[PDB]
Amino acid sequence: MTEYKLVVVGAPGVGSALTIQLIQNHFVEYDPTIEDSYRKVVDGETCLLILDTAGYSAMRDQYMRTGEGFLCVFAINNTKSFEDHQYREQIKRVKDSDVPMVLVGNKCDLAARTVESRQAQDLARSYGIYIETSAKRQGVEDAFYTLVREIRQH
Amino acid sequence: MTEYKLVVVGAPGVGSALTIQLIQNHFVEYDPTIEDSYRKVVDGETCLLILDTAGYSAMRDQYMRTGEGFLCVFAINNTKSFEDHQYREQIKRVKDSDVPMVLVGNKCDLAARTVESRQAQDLARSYGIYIETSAKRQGVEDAFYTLVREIRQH
Ligand SMILES: Nc1nc2c(ncn2[C@@H]2O[C@H](COP(=O)(O)OP(=O)(O)O)[C@@H](O)[C@H]2O)c(=O)[nH]1
Numbered sequence A, B: 001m002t003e004y005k006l007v008v009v010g011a012p013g014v015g016s017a018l019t020i021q022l023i024q025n026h027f028v029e030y031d032p033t034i035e036d037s038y039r040k041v042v043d044g045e046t047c048l049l050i051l052d053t054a055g056y057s058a059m060r061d062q063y064m065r066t067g068e069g070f071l072c073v074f075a076i077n078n079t080k081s082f083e084d085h086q087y088r089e090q091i092k093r094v095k096d097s098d099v100p101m102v103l104v105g106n107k108c109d110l111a112a113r114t115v116e117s118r119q120a121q122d123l124a125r126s127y128g129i130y131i132e133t134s135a136k137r138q139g140v141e142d143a144f145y146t147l148v149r150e151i152r153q154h
C-alpha cells in the first residue's frame, strides 16, 4: 500500500475537524487531541489516506520528524493564524529542509476575514505552494488531495 | 475583475464537456467546437471562470498565443491520449516557454484503462506538475481550480 505519513501542526483555536468531514465523514463538541492519528480511498492513486495534533516543548519536536506533509491550517480570517509562518520554520528546522507544504486557510462561512484571502496569497507567492475551507464539506478533500499532489512530486 | 485566459487543446475523441459539468453545469449528444469560448465564481479568489477547441494547420497556432494555462486532457485509458506530450511542445513552441500546465486524464468510470494512472504519473514526475475526471461531476472543478492554483504562481 502506497501510503503517505503527513501531518498538520496549527494556530490557536480553529479546527482535527477539516478531515472530520472526511475519515469519519461528517461534521461534529469535543475538543481535540493528543496526537489522534488514524489511517484510511482512490485521482486514481492507491493511498491509505492524517495524524491530528493540538490547537509542545519536546513532543512537537518528536512526532514531527516522521512527516511528509505539514500543510498547516489556520482560519482565513484570524489575526494570529497565517501569522502563526510561525509554524513553518520549525518544520524546516526539524527535517532540515528549506518541504511538503501548502497554506490552508480555514473558515469562510462565518463572515469576518482580517486575513483577506488575497493577503496570505502573497505569502503563497514567495512560498510557491493557499486554500479556504469548512467541514460543515466542499474544498476540504480538494486541498488534502492537493496535498497528495505535491508529495508524489517530492 | 481578476480573470484568467487559459485554454485546453487535446487528444482525438474524449471530452468541451469536463467544464460542461460546470459553466452551464450539467452533463450533456452534440459534437463540439469551433473555438467555443465563454466566461463565468469564488478558494476565496475573485475570478471570471474556458475557451474550448476541437477534438489546426494555422488556427491552433493562432488562438493559442493568448493563453495562460493549457493543461490538456485525454481519457486515462486511451492509447493515443497522453501519447498525444504530442500536444505539449507546440504550446512550449508558441509562447516560447519551456508553462502553465497539468496532466489531466479523463474518464475512469468506464472500466478499461491502458493508461494506468500511475503510468502517466512518471510523465508527471519529470514535468513536476496529473488528474482523472468525468462530467456525468467530482474532481472536474478540483482540477481546473487546481489550474487556478499554479497560474497565480506564474
Ligand atoms: N465556522 C466554522 N467552524 C468550523 C469549521 N471547521 C471546523 N469548525 C469548528 O472548529 C472548532 C475548534 O477547533 P479544534 O477542532 O479544536 O482545532 P485545533 O485547536 O486547531 O486542533 C470547533 O468548534 C468546530 O465545531 C469551519 O470551516 N467553519
Ligand SMILES: Nc1nc2c(ncn2[C@@H]2O[C@H](COP(=O)(O)OP(=O)(O)O)[C@@H](O)[C@H]2O)c(=O)[nH]1
Pocket: B010, B011, B012, B013, B014, B015, B016, B017, B018, B028, B029, B030, B031, B032, B033, B053, B054, B055, B106, B107, B108, B109, B110, B133, B134, B135, B136
Ligand atoms: N464515459 C465518459 N464520457 C464522458 C466523460 N466526459 C465526457 N464524456 C463524453 O465525451 C464525448 C466526446 O468528446 P467531445 O466532447 O467531443 O471532446 P473533444 O473531441 O476532445 O473536443 C461525449 O460522448 C461525452 O458524452 C467522462 O468522464 N466519461
